[PDB]
Structure 1
Amino acid sequence: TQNPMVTGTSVLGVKFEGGVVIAADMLGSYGSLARFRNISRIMRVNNSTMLGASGDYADFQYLKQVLGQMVIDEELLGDGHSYSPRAIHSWLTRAMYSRRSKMNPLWNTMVIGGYADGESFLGYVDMLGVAYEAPSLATGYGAYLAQPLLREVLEKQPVLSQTEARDLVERCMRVLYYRDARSYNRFQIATVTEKGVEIEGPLSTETNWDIAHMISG
């Protein structure tokens, strides 16, 4: 896949005490055209993980399917295990990295978030097999707009309530929606706590244009 087709843009991720939050536009673009105006770029992966993916949506439909099959096939044995998030995040690095040696890269950036064993986990994966954990993640254009707001907040209060995180992500989608060309009004927030994987549906973002009356030339 040396050229993507329909891509999603940006995926925010932040840690908080008892879970993680993921965000992402519901938009899939094909050039400048915004061709598919309602897609889910976040998928539930068993009870303690979920993935948000930017980049080519077609390579994502294909993880969505192999990663799903790889989970079903875990629960048939019934032996109680299930994969951590820390496992699903490794397993993906190895897939990218091996599609990079054959030169058929999966053109995605991935955010695996999950909460297991009283521990939050936030994973990133590149189409090269760069991979790491961190308290904050953002992919694509979020790496330069939202990342500085998420990170500023965590270098002066390294914990967060589930209510300060919700707000930290709705303040960062607004900034993304202003300055990023391929963004969309409607976006999804996914939240993994110890109660499971909840996918809040199409939230909107209220804006303001007070500055449309200050340009006069």
Structure 2
Amino acid sequence: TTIVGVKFNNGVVIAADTRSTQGPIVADKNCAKLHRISPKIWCAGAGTAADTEAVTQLIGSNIELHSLYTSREPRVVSALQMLKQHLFKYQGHIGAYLIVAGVDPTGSHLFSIDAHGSTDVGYYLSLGSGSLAAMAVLESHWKQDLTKEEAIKLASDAIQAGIWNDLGSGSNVDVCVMEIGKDAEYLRNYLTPNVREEKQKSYKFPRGTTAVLKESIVNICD
């Protein structure tokens, strides 16, 4: 994974690549690393895949119940506090490395969380194996007072750095824009710069190529 978060004028934008690996093997070429905690709070996750998904769902579930209990829109700091305390409790064994962002009645926010439970604050952040490629771009092109379209460009450029330069990252760029006063817009496969070229040959076999010993109808009805 490469994941980033970038603050702008009236909100925050996060982005991620879509590669999932098992050692040197690409397990999933188009996996979703952007997670919805609440409608306007979203999480980018690197690390152990099942962990980032599960911890994001649990806190998301509890955030929904909290929102219903308090008759209030959930705050990013609540998701941040709940995630960090859960991760700290498990002493790093839950390998979730998260960039938490969103808008709430208090304003727009951007945080990162380490698997051991420490948190950061910043205008631009990157996590994952491709974070050094991403951060190199962010440190080169970031400035104060970014517009929405500038921040999306910067964020996706930072993800691209990871896609091309980090073997842990690849395929596509997902983006989510959280602007104050508006609905969060999830941009699934915002960029797809890794489309497979046409194959040289069709490997469709002549029917009857495979030797068969038995046939039978399977009953799926009651």
Question: TM tier, shorter chain?
Answer: 0.7 to 0.9
Task: Measure, in 1, the Cα distance between the counterparts of 2:153 and 2:167.
Answer: 23
Matched, 1:99 2:90: yes
The 5 Å alignment of 1:39-78 reads 39-77=31-69
Matched, 1:119 2:84: no
Secondary structure of 2:38's aligned partner: coil
Q: Which residue of 1 aligns with 2:187?
A: 200
Structure 2 residue ranges without an equivalent (≥5): 196-222
Are the counterparts in 2 of residues 44 and 197 from structure 1 also a CA contact under 8 Å? no
Are the counterparts in 2 of residues 71 and 82 from structure 1 also a CA contact under 8 Å? no
- What code does the residue aligned with 2:19 have? L
Task: Measure, in 1, the Cα distance between the counterparts of 2:39 and 2:6.
Answer: 18
- With the length of structure 1 as denominator, give the TM-score of the two structures: 0.81
Task: Measure, in 1, the Cα distance between the counterparts of 2:136 and 2:30.
Answer: 28
Q: Which residue of 2 aligns with 1:139?
A: 127
- What code does the residue aligned with 2:166 have? D
Are the counterparts in 2 of residues 170 and 205 from structure 1 also a CA contact under 8 Å? no
Task: Measure, in 2, the Cα distance between the counterparts of 1:206 and 1:10.
Answer: 16
Are the counterparts in 2 of residues 74 and 82 from structure 1 also a CA contact under 8 Å? no
Could you say if the C-alpha distance between residues 65 and 47 of structure 1 is closer, same or farther in structure 2, counting changes exceeding 3 Å?
closer
Structure 1 residue ranges without an equivalent (≥5): 1-8, 208-217
Q: How many residues align?
A: 193
Q: Which residue of 2 aligns with 1:210?
A: none
Identity score, percent: 21
Q: Which runs of 4+ in 1 moved over 4 A?
A: none
Are the counterparts in 2 of residues 23 and 189 from structure 1 also a CA contact under 8 Å? yes
Are the counterparts in 2 of residues 18 and 118 from structure 1 also a CA contact under 8 Å? no
Q: Which residue of 1 aligns with 2:176?
A: 190
Task: Measure, in 2, the Cα distance between the counterparts of 1:137 and 1:42.
Answer: 15
Give 1:87's match in structure 2, choosing from 46, 66, 78.
Answer: 78
Are the counterparts in 2 of residues 28 and 35 from structure 1 also a CA contact under 8 Å? yes
Could you say if the C-alpha distance between residues 173 and 115 of structure 1 is closer, same or farther in structure 2, counting changes exceeding 3 Å?
same
Deviation at 1:63, TM superposition (A): 1.3
- What code does the residue aligned with 1:91 have? M
- What code does the residue aligned with 2:188 have? G
Are the counterparts in 1 of residues 8 and 146 from structure 2 also a CA contact under 8 Å? yes
Task: Measure, in 2, the Cα distance between the counterparts of 1:20 and 1:129.
Answer: 22
Are the counterparts in 2 of residues 27 and 37 from structure 1 also a CA contact under 8 Å? yes
Are the counterparts in 1 of residues 6 and 14 from structure 2 also a CA contact under 8 Å? yes
Are the counterparts in 2 of residues 18 and 115 from structure 1 also a CA contact under 8 Å? no
Q: Which residue of 2 aligns with 1:5?
A: none
Q: Which residue of 2 aligns with 1:169?
A: 155
Secondary structure of 1:137's aligned partner: strand
Deviation at 1:108, TM superposition (A): 1.3
- With the length of structure 2 as denominator, give the TM-score of the two structures: 0.80
